[PDB]
Amino acid sequence: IIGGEFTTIENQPWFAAIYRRHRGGSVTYVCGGSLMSPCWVISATHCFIDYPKKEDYIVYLGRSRLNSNTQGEMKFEVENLILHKDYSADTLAHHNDIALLKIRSKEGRCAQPSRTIQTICLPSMYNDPQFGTSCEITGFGKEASTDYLYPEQLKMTVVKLISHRECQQPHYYGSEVTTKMLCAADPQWKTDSCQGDSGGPLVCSLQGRMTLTGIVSWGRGCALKDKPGVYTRVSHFLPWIRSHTKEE
């Protein structure tokens, strides 16, 4: 996240950190995600696309640091990895960039409620905040697009939602942004999501609840003028989410 503040998971208790294991001894961070229900985390397909081998990913909940433990953190394996059929990437945008990960603990359980682990809410069918709403994004992504490492502390920032008319203007992204995407930026292009923040949440308050409005998906550069961050429009994927999620 460029700009922002450093936070702890108590402030984003539904944030999930996804890592991949290497036949060598190292685990590296891949992307962020959000907890929807006890056993399901939602992230972005492009984070898995290149290596869809579920057994090599590990998911941690209750995590405030990247490679050091946080007391209260829970570790899970990916029991199911569901990528979106119709997922596409062009020279910028990713289309239908949403993925579901069913988690299982080594003891056979899903997440448990704590002060650092909570679920986030889902919007109702095609329901979004209006452009102008200030939403917050969180993640361990880059702090500068030229960095080659990720911060060790979780960060958060606030961005405002912008209309499609503004984002589809030629000097922004043209028709690369579709109705199934959302754009968010800082009025003064000072803070924004960036690489390593993919899959994480764009949370806004809708009808009283803190709702997962978008998933970090792409952007041209980070915190670049007239280059907003583009997010997957969750309110438009509800059927798809439903047809794959069940029980507690």
Partner: peptide, 9 residues
């Protein structure tokens, strides 16, 4: 206690 979506504590 139990999950209350969207709640920070």
């Amino acid at each position: 206690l139990k999950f209350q979506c969207g709640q920070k504590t």
